[PDB]
């Protein structure tokens, strides 16, 4: 039922009880949950909702969470039954819990972990304690095709049965349709095929409370369970993965986005694990190492996604990997997994425990529902504002700066209607002046300035006119690291211009001032992840609530505005605010480029030359 | 417009009749500036006119501006007046009627405004001060509910006529309830003291319509202002016009009375501060704020009455409705729609600041500056273009002629815009005729 | 003689160029923007000006997002 104002009239189905201020939760029958942070029971409710519900919005005071079948499965596999969840909900709900939500929870929890998938002898078996379920499922044609066929094409016979390797993800999706999701549980201590490894945790390793909480939630009753953990960049997420690998101590395979990711993973493993370097190898095309005796093998998706013929040695290493069965597999940048080629990698590799870590989980192509069974339920997601309060990461000062359009530029922008409009507003003379003023001001403040520009041409022109280092498609790796070290060590040069490769193609040194000029055009997760990775925790200004500075230049009256509001929405979900700065104080006195419009019309000439 | 503004616009006879009531004298004196109060106290017992230069010599040279401000305010209020002192001089002397009534109010003597309630003894059905304040709040909420158009508030038809005369609701279709106009929308977001003050100003501006003595109504309003909360007073001794005005006030809840025949009446704090209008009541213990404004443009309401629900929905998209809570979101769409309805952004910002939840009060700014600035920017973006109908004068072949015509038009004050460099200008349609005639006449004289 | 009484519009230079494009490109169709007047002011017939603002209403609409 809907009110004339459009709001949902849930009052009738919600019996309100007098314990209003004491209880902090609202449970609408839509499945959504609302929590008040100012309530004294905030911490307990916070942990309960995190355990049971997937967070949606966490602004300063009131937070919204959501209930999903995957969230309920995660809660059940943690070890919580229906009665306890219902009791705790009713103890925290301001109003009575609607019977519809109760029934939904009952239906979800009554069948969770019913079906078990076992990887033994390089063979995948489906087994359970309810043979009627399995027998009834045999009628499903997709299950019939997924089931392993004999040499004669016949079907292979708590008795389990082998399933075709290629048809795992098909079974993964199908089981959801069968309302009987599989269980990704590993024999952490009962393992006998794969022995342990001489790898432990160095005493220098420190588990921050949220990291330890996430790890222990993953280790449900001491058994590792597949899932995804979301942590901000530089919050020890790599350290968290290293710690998990050390805990498992079984054969470990790690996949990174690029070669720099592999190098960082190897360095982190050396920095905190006791594994000897003889057992660490990088399955890359540049640094080749023998796979034999390699306890922890680090590679990239492309090195496993090569449909084309590889090098002969690469073929041998792939054969070794396929033969070997992995107790643990680690995937970084999970948001890139839903791509078809990378999804095929999961079928290619046979591993028991797969764990995914990333900074964001909102793929703009909404290919995330499948990921809930590609890997598993979202294990954890730390509150960004809470981590800011604890000082684990910098307390960022976000800002969106609007730049007026030159009349000639705006007339041209309106004249064009196709995708070619990108160049004009990305080359706004006023935007150039604003960026120059910001760079001058922060250099006078002695700040680490990193300027992003997704457009290749705009990046080149901006960096060259400002005479600052620029990195783009070519990105000669040796010279790339040379520029990075110049920024890190030389105080004379502290202004680095980086193209789209700054997302995941290399390592970003910790900075304090991040100026984003051009973006993908709606990649709400990509540039938010770029902001998270660029700005890290810095000593000295921890007490202040604004120790990291982020500026997003947007051209007024352009379509770019529509992108920015579309994009930073994700950061709004984390409580981050963006104050509009139409005009910058101090630009008048300081001399900047394009003071004359005669220069600006020459710039327009240059831009229009490239159509 | 404060109370003194309306008093300064009344006829001298009305002021003289008002001065006959000691309460009116007390109110006027209390509403004076401090320097004016000091001068009045000085002139309280001066039976002779005071030379104007002598009065002017009392104040500081630097404070001569404020001195003259107070002097003009007093002269406009007709508290004092100028007298032809012998020899051509102009003395100053208070109004003898006003001065005598003020002395009666202050020194004592004279007759009490009304008899004590002890004549009827204790009230059989007496109420309590919290009960009276709650009843007044209920009455005003019912009035606003009728303004909304909800069927819950069945109020007197004369009240609807009064609102229509105020222009809040125009009854385009008789029989159907009138639709609230843009001015009514702006009034709807005003603070309750401001709402009452504006309504009473409209009533006073339309006082003659009901054949009621404006002087008597103002005197009774001042007497209510200086009354004591929690104490009743004698209804008797008042004209039938004042009786019906009191009935109207009871209909608004400003004064409580159990029955129309009851000879007692309890003024409310709203009525007490009603004379002060918007200012004066600096210690208004308003209801606790139940609106939480989050950085994601979300409003959460801890309310149950439809009145605040409508107020919030005026500028935000309702999302969920819980028994004790309403979840809404402030969007560009809803704010632009409200502005199209005539509501200004400042009204929304001030309203939200007024109904601010105590939790957000802990923040050094009451509300997130981002949201306020976004609302301001939406308001500006609504009014980006400037429209002005006019006539273009662009056939200027001479610069001297253009300058002369522009000077003449500025003399007429009909200029819209001027451009000497291009010798082009725009004029109002009204001022177009005169400028055209002058141009033709000067061509003829050439 | 030839002097026109219509409605003038005053806006920022960006809107001025937008109106110039509307007139020249005939996006509104008929060239109802007969002639501008000043560096930030234009002169149009009141017949179309409403719909003119309509186009402007869409423009600032398209430079925004819906929630």
């Amino acid at each position: 039922k809907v009110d004339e104002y459009g709001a949902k009239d849930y009052r009738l189905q919600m019996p309100l009880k007098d314990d209003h201020t004491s209880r902090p939760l609202w449970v609408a029958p839509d499945g959504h949950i609302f929590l008040e942070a100012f309530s004294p029971v905030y911490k307990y409710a916070q942990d309960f909702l995190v355990a049971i519900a997937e967070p949606v919005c966490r602004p300063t005071h009131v937070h919204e969470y959501k209930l999903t079948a995957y969230s309920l499965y995660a809660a059940v596999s943690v070890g919580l039954q229906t009665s306890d969840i219902t009791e705790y909900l009713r103890k925290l709900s301001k109003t009575g819990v609607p019977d519809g939500i109760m029934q939904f929870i009952k239906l979800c929890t009554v069948s969770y972990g019913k079906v078990k998938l076992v990887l033994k002898h390089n063979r995948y078996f489906v087994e359970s304690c309810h043979p009627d379920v399995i027998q009834h499922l045999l009628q499903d044609p997709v299950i019939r095709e997924c089931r392993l066929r004999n040499s004669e094409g016949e079907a292979t016979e708590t008795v389990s049965f082998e399933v075709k390797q290629e048809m795992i993800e098909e079974l993964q999706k199908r089981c959801i349709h069968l309302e009987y999701p599989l269980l990704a549980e590993y024999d952490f201590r009962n393992d006998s095929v794969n022995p342990d490894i001489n790898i432990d945790l160095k005493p220098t390793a420190v588990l921050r409370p949220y990291q330890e909480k996430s790890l222990r939630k993953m280790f449900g009753n001491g058994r590792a369970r597949s899932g995804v953990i979301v942590l901000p960049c530089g919050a020890g997420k790599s350290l968290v993965g290293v710690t998990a690998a050390c805990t498992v101590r079984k054969r470990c395979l790690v996949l990174g986005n690029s070669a720099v990711s592999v190098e960082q993973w190897k360095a982190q493993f050396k920095m905190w694990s006791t594994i000897d370097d003889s057992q660490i190898c990088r399955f890359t095309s540049d640094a080749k190492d023998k796979p034999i005796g390699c306890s922890v093998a680090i590679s990239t998706y492309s090195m496993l996604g090569h449909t084309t013929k590889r090098s002969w040695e690469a073929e041998r290493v792939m054969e070794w990997l396929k033969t070997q069965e992995w107790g643990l597999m680690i995937l970084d940048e999970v948001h890139t997994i839903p791509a078809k080629m990378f999804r095929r990698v999961l079928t290619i590799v046979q591993a028991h425990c797969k764990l995914g870590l990333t900074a964001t989980l909102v793929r703009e192509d909404d290919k995330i529902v499948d990921l809930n069974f590609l890997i598993g339920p979202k294990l954890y997601e730390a509150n960004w504002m809470e981590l800011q309060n604890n000082g684990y990461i910098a307390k960022v000062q976000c800002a969106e700066v609007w730049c007026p359009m030159s009349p000639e530029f705006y007339r041209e922008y309106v004249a064009i209607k196709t995708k070619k409009r990108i160049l004009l507003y990305t080359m706004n003379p006023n935007k150039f002046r604003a960026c120059q003023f910001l760079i001058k001001f922060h250099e006078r403040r002695n700040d680490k300035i990193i300027v992003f520009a997704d457009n290749v041409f705009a990046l080149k022109e901006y960096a060259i006119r400002l005479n600052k280092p620029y990195i783009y498609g070519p990105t000669s790796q040796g010279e790339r690291m040379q520029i990075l070290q110049n920024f890190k060590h030389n105080p004379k040069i502290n202004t680095i211009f980086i193209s789209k490769v700054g997302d995941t193609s290399f390592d970003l040194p910790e900075a304090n001032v991040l100026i984003q000029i051009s973006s993908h055009g709606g990649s709400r997760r990509q540039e938010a992840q770029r902001l998270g990775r660029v700005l890290r925790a810095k000593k000295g200004m921890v007490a202040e609530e604004y120790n990291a500075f982020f500026y997003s230049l947007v051209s007024q009256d352009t379509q770019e505005m529509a992108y920015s509001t579309k994009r930073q929405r994700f950061l709004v979900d984390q409580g981050y605010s963006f104050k509009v700065i139409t005009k910058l104080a101090g630009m008048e006195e300081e001399d900047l480029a394009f003071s004359t419009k005669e220069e600006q019309q020459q710039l327009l000439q240059k831009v229009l030359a490239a159509t | 417009r404060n109370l003194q503004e309306f008093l300064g616009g009344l006829s001298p006879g009305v002021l003289d009749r008002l001065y006959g009531h000691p309460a009116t004298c007390l109110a006027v004196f209390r509403e004076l500036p401090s320097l004016a109060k000091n001068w009045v106290m000085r002139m309280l017992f001066l039976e002779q006119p005071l030379p104007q230069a002598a009065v002017a010599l009392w104040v500081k040279k630097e404070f001569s501006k404020a001195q003259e401000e107070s002097t003009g305010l007093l002269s406009g209020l007709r508290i004092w007046h100028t007298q032809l002192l012998p020899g051509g001089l102009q003395g100053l002397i208070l109004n003898p009627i006003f001065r005598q009534n003020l002395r009666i109010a202050l020194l004592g003597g004279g007759k009490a405004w009304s008899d004590d309630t002890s004549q009827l003894g204790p009230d059989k059905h007496a109420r309590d001060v919290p009960s009276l304040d709650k009843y007044a709040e209920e009455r005003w909420e019912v009035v606003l509910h009728f303004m909304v158009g909800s069927p819950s508030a069945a109020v007197s038809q004369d009240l609807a006529q009064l609102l229509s005369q105020a222009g809040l609701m125009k009854s385009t279709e008789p029989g159907e309830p009138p639709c609230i106009t843009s001015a009514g929308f702006q009034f709807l977001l005003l603070d309750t003291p401001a709402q009452l003050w504006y309504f009473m100003l409209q009533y006073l501006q339309t006082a003659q319509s009901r054949g009621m003595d404006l002087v008597e109504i103002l005197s009774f309003l001042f007497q209510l202002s200086f009354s004591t909360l929690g104490k009743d007073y004698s209804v008797e001794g008042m004209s039938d016009s004042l009786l019906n005005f009191l009935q109207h006030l009871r209909e608004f809840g400003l004064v409580f009375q159990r029955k129309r025949k009851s000879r007692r009446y309890y003024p409310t704090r709203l009525a007490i501060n009603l004379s002060s209008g918007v200012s004066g009541a600096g210690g208004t213990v308003h209801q606790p704020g139940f609106i939480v404004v989050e950085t994601n443009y979300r409003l959460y309401a801890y309310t149950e009455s439809e009145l605040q629900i409508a107020l919030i929905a005026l500028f935000s998209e309702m999302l969920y409705r819980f028994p004790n809570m309403v979840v809404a979101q402030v969007t560009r769409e809803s704010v632009q729609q409200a502005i199209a309805s005539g509501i200004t952004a400042q009204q929304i910002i001030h309203f939200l600041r007024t109904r601010a939840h105590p939790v957000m009060l802990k923040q050094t700014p009451v509300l997130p500056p981002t949201i306020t600035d976004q609302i301001r920017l939406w308001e500006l973006e609504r009014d980006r273009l400037r429209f002005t109908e006019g006539v273009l004068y662009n056939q200027f072949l001479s610069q001297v002629d253009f300058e002369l015509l522009l000077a003449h038009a500025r003399e007429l004050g009909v200029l819209v815009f001027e451009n000497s460099a291009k010798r082009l200008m725009v004029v109002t349609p009204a001022g177009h005729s005169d400028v055209k005639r002058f141009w033709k006449r000067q061509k003829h004289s050439s | 003689v030839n002097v026109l009484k219509g409605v003038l519009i005053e806006c920022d230079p960006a809107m001025k160029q937008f109106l110039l494009y509307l007139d020249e490109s005939n996006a509104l169709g008929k060239k109802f923007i007969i002639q501008d007047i000043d560096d930030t002011h234009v002169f149009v017939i009141a017949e179309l000006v409403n719909v003119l603002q309509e186009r402007v209403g869409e423009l600032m609409d398209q430079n925004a997002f819906s929630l």
Partner: peptide
């Protein structure tokens, strides 16, 4: 040129949200 700089400053002052605020009339700078 000085004239060009003055014209550019004037047209920049004609920026949309800035002119409204000026007619009506944190960060380190």
């Amino acid at each position: 040129g000085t004239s060009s700089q003055a014209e550019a400053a004037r047209i920049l002052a004609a920026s949309w949200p800035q002119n409204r605020e000026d007619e009506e009339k944190l960060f380190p700078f």
